[PDB]
Amino acid sequence: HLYPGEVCPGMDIRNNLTRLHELENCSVIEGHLQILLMFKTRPEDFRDLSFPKLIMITDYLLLFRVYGLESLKDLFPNLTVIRGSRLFFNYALVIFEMVHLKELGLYNLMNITRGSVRIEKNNELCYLATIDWSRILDSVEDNYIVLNKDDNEECGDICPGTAKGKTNCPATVQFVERCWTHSHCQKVCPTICKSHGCTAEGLCCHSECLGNCSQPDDPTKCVACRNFYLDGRCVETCPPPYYHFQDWRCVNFSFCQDLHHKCKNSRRQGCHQYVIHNNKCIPECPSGYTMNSSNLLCTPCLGPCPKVCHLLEGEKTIDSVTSAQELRGCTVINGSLIINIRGGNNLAAELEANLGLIEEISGYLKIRRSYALVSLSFFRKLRLIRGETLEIGNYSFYALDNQNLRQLWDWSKHNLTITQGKLFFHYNPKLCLSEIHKMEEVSGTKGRQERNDIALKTNGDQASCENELLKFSYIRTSFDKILLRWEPYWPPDFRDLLGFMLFYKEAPYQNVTEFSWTVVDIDPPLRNHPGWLMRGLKPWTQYAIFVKTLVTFSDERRTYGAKSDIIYVQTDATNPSVPLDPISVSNSSSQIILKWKPPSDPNGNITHYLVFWERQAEDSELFELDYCLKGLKLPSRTDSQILKELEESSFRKTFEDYLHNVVFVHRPFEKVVNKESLVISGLRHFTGYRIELQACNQDTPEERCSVAAYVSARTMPEAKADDIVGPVTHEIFENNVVHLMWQEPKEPNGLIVLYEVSYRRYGDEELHLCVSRKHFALERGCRLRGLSPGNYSVRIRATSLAGNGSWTEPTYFYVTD
Amino acid sequence: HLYPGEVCPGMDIRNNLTRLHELENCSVIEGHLQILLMFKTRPEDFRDLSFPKLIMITDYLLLFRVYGLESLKDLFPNLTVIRGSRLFFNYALVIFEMVHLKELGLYNLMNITRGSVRIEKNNELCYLATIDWSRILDSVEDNYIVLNKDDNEECGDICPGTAKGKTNCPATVQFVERCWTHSHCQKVCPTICKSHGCTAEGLCCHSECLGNCSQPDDPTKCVACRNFYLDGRCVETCPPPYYHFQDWRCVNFSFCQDLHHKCKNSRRQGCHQYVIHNNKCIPECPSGYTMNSSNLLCTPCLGPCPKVCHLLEGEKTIDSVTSAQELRGCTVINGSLIINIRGGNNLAAELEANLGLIEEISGYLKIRRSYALVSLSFFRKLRLIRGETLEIGNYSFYALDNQNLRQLWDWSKHNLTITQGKLFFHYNPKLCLSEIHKMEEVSGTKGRQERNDIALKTNGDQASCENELLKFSYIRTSFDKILLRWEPYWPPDFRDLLGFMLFYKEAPYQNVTEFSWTVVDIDPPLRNHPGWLMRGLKPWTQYAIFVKTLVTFSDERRTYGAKSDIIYVQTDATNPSVPLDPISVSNSSSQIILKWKPPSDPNGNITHYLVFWERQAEDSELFELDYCLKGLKLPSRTDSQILKELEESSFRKTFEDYLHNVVFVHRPFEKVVNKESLVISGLRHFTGYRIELQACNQDTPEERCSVAAYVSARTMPEAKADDIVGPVTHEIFENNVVHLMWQEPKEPNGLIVLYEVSYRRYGDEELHLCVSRKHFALERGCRLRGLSPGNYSVRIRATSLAGNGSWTEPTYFYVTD
C-alpha cells in the first residue's frame, strides 16, 4: 500500500504530449523527469491534465521550452521531495527558458536532499522572491536565479491574507512573507523538529517520515521515508533478508536476481548487471571484486580478475587515445576491434597502459591505415584470437596500409594462436616476410593461407631485415672525437653494396631498444678496414652506436646484409668549467665563510676542490702620504626587457663559449672534498685576502683540472686592538715645548693612519691637533708650542682603517706658570 | 704622412704573446682589437712592451682574462678615439674579468663616437669613480660598471695635486675630481668648443680635428679626422675622384679595384667584394642593385637580378628552415646541395619562399632520407643542373630513402635539363616509375642510365599511380546526408580488386590539390552501381570528394586502377539557430530600440529577420484590489574558477545541442532586412510589450526558418498624462458630507492605482486621506465626514504605476459654520 501505482523509470518526453500520459498510474519516479521541446502545445491542452499521484522523484526535474505551460500547480500537486540521487550538472531542479510560465505552484515540496535549484530565462514567471529556499533546501549557497521577471521590480507577488491582515502563513527574514502561489502559500513547521515535518495542528511526525505525515508519531503513516521504504513502513535500515536498493527502498533477493536475469540477455540498452554486495544491490561489483554467478556476491578476486567488456554491435574503431580510454581495464573483448591511429603524441605507452590487459578477442583484429604505429607491442597480454566472427573472405588478422609498422611482437618471448580464419597483409612496407612466416608457423595458420592472401611484393620491400652480424674491430676514444672500425663485409656480388650507415645518440641509460637518431653515411671501401671518425661529441657521455649496411634490391635471392649489435661507448673526461657564484663573507676576526656552486660543465665527477687564499699587504701610499693635511679623504676601508635579457644572456653565453675551447695543457691551500662550502681560521684581523678557487676531478695520475676563479674579502677588525696602551709622558725643554712620549698601538687594524691630540685649560675650551705618521716618526711623539702656561689635560685618540678610536683617559698635567 | 705606419686589420690575439708584436709599425686599426686567454703571461713580460703609435681604432677593444696585465698606460699610450663602426654586443669597449689590472691608464682617449663602456668583474681595478664619462662618451646612459673594486669603498684613488692643493686638473659634478691614473689625470677642454679639442694653452683646434691637435686652427695638424682622412689633411667630404672608404678615409678607384681583384679569387675567407656606389666603396651592392664588372657600379637591376651564392667547399646540407635561411634570395648556387629535412612544421611554403628563386645548381642535387618532404614543388624556378661536379659513379640526381616523396614536379608545366651524370632513385616507396620515365625522356638522360642505376623494385610499389578515370553516376544531397554513386569499374581480373576508398574534407575554397582527409572504405559490389552514403556532415558547406580504387599488386602487368576527379559538393541548408543576446531599451514614450546578434549557426544566408511585438494588458488584480488599505505594497513597475567556467560552458553547450536536433517541420510585425537593430514607433506610453524575435533565410518558396527568441520591455511614461484636469467641485448634502466631483485622468500611465485628498483649516494642520478605485467608483468621487465647519482648502494628488503625481492647485472652499 501507501502508493496506488507502481514505480516508473524516468523518461524523456519530447515533441508530443501522447508520451506524457504514461504516468497514469505510477506514483514514484526512480529516474529523472525531463519535459522539453514542446512547441505546438497550447495552454488549453494543460487545462485537463494532472498527475496527483506523483509524490517521490529520485534524480531531478528538468523543463525547457514548453510552450503553453502556465503553472505546475496542477501538473505536480503532491511532489513532496526530490531525492537528488544523480544530479544534472550539479542541479536537482532545472527550469530553463520556460515561456508562458507564471508561477511555480509546487506548494507541496518541502525537502530537497541534494543539489541546488537553477531557474533562469523566465521573463513571465513570478513568485520567486516570496520563496524561503532556506527552509526548502539545506544548502542554498549554490542557487542560481537570474534573468527573470522578478529580477526587475515588475512582479506583483500577492498571496492570500492581505485582505484580512496577512494571515494563513507567517513571514521570516528583514521580515518578509513566504508564499508559493496566489492561492497556496508556503508551510513552515516549527523549528523544534528539523525535517520530520508537522501536521496541520503542528504536531511533529515520526523520526522516519520526511516532509509530510498523516498521524503524528507514526512510522507507518509517513508519506516519504527518510532512510528506506519498506511495505508502507519507513525504516532506518532494511533488516535481512532484504537489501537496500536504489538508496531509498528495500528489496528481496528474488527481485535483484530477476533484474540481473533481465540484464544478461533481454536488456540491450544500458541495463545494470545488479549484484548483491555489502547488503546493497549495487549496479556493479566495485573495484577489486568479482561476480560469481551462483549467488552474485562481490567476492574479492585474487589478482587480475575478469572484466568482460561487450562491444556495441561487435565493432569498435580506435582512432585516438580517448577512444582507448573507454576500453581501459578490459581483459576480454566480446567482439571485433579496429585500429585506425593516424596521429598523436607519446603513443605506445598510454595505449599500452589502457589496452595492455587485453587477453582475448572474440572476433577479428584489424589494423588499417595506422600511420603512427611502430609496433604492436602495446598489446602486452594478447594471447588468443577466438575469431568466431570473420570478415568477408573469412579473415581473422587484417593489416593494411601501415607505413611505420616494423614488427608485431617478439617471438622469442610472446605466444599467440588464432582459431578461425586466415591472415591478411598488404601495403606494409616496413615489415619483412620473416614475421609473416613466423605467423604461419606459430599461429598454426600455415595450412589456411592460400594464393593472394599475403602480398609477396608490397610487404618486405622497403624494410630493414638484415640477418647477418657485424663486429667492431678497432675502437678508440678521446675527449671529443671517437674513431670506429669494423670487419669489411662484402655481399656475394660486390656491385650490389651501396654503403654503410652509422647511428648514434645520447645514451644516459642502457634501456635503448632502437624503436631521435643521428645518421651518417659511409662509402664502401676500395676492395683496409672501413670506418668513421666522429667530431661533434660532448665529453664524458655514454653513446649508443650501431652500424647497418645498405644493399641494393637485386631481383635474385635477397642479400639481407648485416647490422651490428647496439654497443655503449663512453667519451673521455676533460677539465671542468669554472665554479659558479663564488661569494665570501666575514663573520669574525679570522673566520671567513666561502660559498660556491658546482661547475656547469663537470666533464666528469668532481673529486675535490682547490682553494688558494693569500694575504695581501696594505696599499703603499697609506704609509708615506699624510691623511690629515689640508685636503684629504678618510680611508674608510669597508619587449625591450625581453630583448635586453636575451642580449645579456647571449653576451654571457659568448664569453662562456670563449672559455670552453681554451684547449688546456707557496700559499696556504686546502683541498675540500665533496663540500661546496669552506671556512678559514688563523688569519690576521682586518687584512685584505685574495682567494683563488678551482674545481678538480683527477688527483693522482698526472692531475689536471679547471682554471681558477678569483674573489677577495677582508676580515672583521678588533675594537680592542686599536686602543692606546701606556702612560702619556710629557716634558718641556725650554718654553712650553710639550714632548709627548707614549707607546704606539703596535697591533692596529691594518695600520695607524693618524693620531689626534686634544688639550684643554681648566674651565676653558679644548683645542685639538692632528699628528701624521711622518711627523710622529720624526718627532717620536708630538710637539706642542705656543701654549699659555698653566694646568692642562690631554686627550689622545688613535685612528686606523676601521675608523675613529677611543680617546684615552685625560691625564691632567701642569706646566710651570 | 701623419702616420708612421700602415693600417692593420683587426686580429684575435690568444694564447701567445708572439702574435701581439704584429703591430710593430701600424698606427691605425681598421678592425677590432681583442686580447683574451693569456694565462702563462707574467707581469714582467709587459714591462718592456708598448705600442706608442696606436692612435685610431675603428670597431672596439676587448680584453678578457689576461693574467699579468697591470695597467694599459704603457700598452696604449696614445689611443685617441675609438670610432665604434661595428659594436660588440652594443659595446665599444669591453673589459671583462681582468685580474691583476690596477688602473686603466687610457689618459689620451677623449672621444668615443658610438656605443658605451662595459667594465665588469675587476676585483683589483681602481680609478673608476674618478672618470668623467660624460666628457668622454656623448651618451653615458648605456654604461655598465658593476662588481669591481670600486663598487665597495676600497680604493684610495689618489691622483696628483693633493700634496699641492689639488691642482693640475679641475673637478666637476657634487664637485668631484676627475683623473685617470696616479700620475696622469683627465684633461677637459673648455665648453666653448664641443669636440674639436684644445691645446695646452686652451686654444681650440680646427673644426675638422677630433680629440687632439698640435697647432690651433689648422686642419692639416689634426691627429684624428672628424669626418674623413685624406693625405694628412682632414676634410668634411672626399672630393672626386676619391670615394669614402670604411667611413673614415678616402681612397682612389685603383685601391678599391685592387681590393675587388684580391677578393674575387685570391681571398677565400670572408673578403668583401667592394663595389663603388653613391660615391662610397660599399662592401656589396645594396638591395635592388647589381654589380657590373666593367666599372663596379651598383646600377639598378631590372626585375630579379643575379645574386650568386658561392658555397663553402661546394657542399651544403639543409636540415631545417634555419639552414635554408642562409640561402634566401640566392638565384644561382655555385656548388652542390644536399637536402636532409627530417621534420618540421608548415614546410613547402617557407622553404619555397627561401629557395624558390634558385635557377641553377652548378654541382649536384641530392635528396637523402628526407622524411618530411612530400614533393619538390618548392624548387619553383629550378631549370638547369650544370652538374660540373659529380659524385662517385658520375651521378647528378640522388634520391634515397624518401618515405613521403610523392612527386617531383608537374611536367605539363615545368621544364628541366641535366648536362652531366646520370640519375639515381632507390627506396622511394611513394613515387611511381612514371615520373622516372618522364625524367629519362625530359632530362635527356635516357641514353645515360644503365643497369642498377634506377631501382625497379623499391620505387613504384607502395605508391598510388592510378591512370584510368572514374565518373560519378548518381549524386544527390540533403540537409545532413549525401548519397554518392559511380560507374562500376572492374579490373581485367576481377579477383584482384579489394575495394574502393572515399576521401572527403571541408572545402571552403576551391584551391584543393590533394597534397587532413577522412577515409572511408567500401567493399566491392557483388558482380548494381557501387556507392556510399554520408551521415556526419554539417549543413550548408562545400565538400571535396574523390574516390580512389584499391587493387592488389599482381606479379603481371600492373592494373593501375582508376581514381576519379576532385569534385565540390555543397550540402543543403536548414533553419538557423536562435539569435543571440536580444536586448531591448526604451528611450521615449513610444520609441524602443532593439539589439541582437546573428545566430551562431546560420545554416545558410540570413535573408531577413522577423520581429513580433504584442501589447500586453496590465495585471488584473491591479484593478479590483485596493492598494492603500492597512497593509499594502507600492506597485513600482520599473582552479575552481576554471572548473566552474567549464561546467557552465558545458551546461550551455548541452542545451544548445538539445536545441540543435529538434528536427523541425494577427500581431504588428515587420521584416528587418540586412540589419541587426530595429526601432518601433506608435506605442502606448508605459505599457508592457512582449517581443518575439526570429531569424529567417528562405522567403518565397515555402518559407521556413528558426525558432523564436523572446524578450520584453516597457515604454517610458509621460509626466504630463497623470496630471489632474478639471475643477474640483464640492457639495454638502446635510452635515459636512463633502462630495468631490472632479474628472479622472482618463489617460494614465497604465492605470490610476489610488487617489489621495488632503484638506487643511486656515492656520491649522493639513490632514490627508486615501481614495481607492472601488470607493471612488462607488461614490463617484470622495466622501468626507466628521469635519468641523469653516473655510478649508483641498489638495488632490493622483498616483499611477509610474509613481506619485502632482497635487492640484489648492482651491479654498468654505463650508457653512
Numbering used by the authors:
A (entry chain A), B (entry chain B): 1 to 173, 177 to 518, 528 to 539, 547 to 657, 689 to 715, 768 to 919
Authors' text:
To further investigate why IGF2 binds to IR-B with a lower affinity, we determined the cryo-EM structure of the ligand-free, apo-IR-B dimer, at 3.9 Å resolution. The overall structure of the IR-B dimer in the apo-state assumes a classical Λ-shape, similar to the crystal structure of apo-IR-A45. The two IR-B protomers tightly pack together primarily through the interaction between L1/L2 domains of one protomer and FnIII-2’/FnIII-1’ domains of the other. This Λ-shaped conformation imposes a distance of approximately 120 Å between the two membrane-proximal domains of the IR-B, indicating that this is the inactive form. Notably, the 12-residue extension in the C-terminus of α-CT of IR-B was not resolved in the cryo-EM map of apo-IR-B, presumably due to structural flexibility. Nevertheless, the residues immediately preceding the 12-residue extension in the C-terminal region of α-CT are well folded and form an extended loop in the structure of apo-IR-B. As a result, the α-CT motif in the apo-IR-B becomes longer as compared to that in the apo-IR-A, and thus can reach and contact the FnIII-2 domain of the same IR protomer through the interaction between Phe714 from α-CT and Asn594 from FnIII-2 domain. We, therefore, hypothesized that the additional structural restraint of the C-terminal part of α-CT imposed by the α-CT/FnIII-2 interaction in the apo-IR-B might hinder its threading into the C-loop of IGF2, thus largely reducing the association rate of IGF2 with IR-B. To test this idea, we introduced N594A, N594R, and N594E mutations into IR-B to disrupt the interface. Indeed, IR-B N594A, N594R, and N594E mutants exhibited increased IGF2- and insulin-dependent IR-B activation, when expressed in 293FT cells. These data suggest that the structural restraint of the C-terminal segment of α-CT by the α-CT/FnIII-2 interaction regulates ligand-dependent IR-B activation and explain the lower binding affinity of IGF2 to IR-B as compared to IR-A.
Insulin receptor (IR) is a receptor tyrosine kinase that plays critical roles in cellular signaling, growth, and metabolism. IR can be activated by two highly related ligands – insulin and insulin-like growth factor 2 (IGF2). Consequently, IR-B has an additional 12 amino acids at the C-terminal helix of the alpha subunit (α-CT), while IR-A lacks this segment. Here, we present cryo-EM structures of full-length human long isoform IR (IR-B) in both the inactive and IGF2-bound active states, and short isoform IR (IR-A) in the IGF2-bound active state.
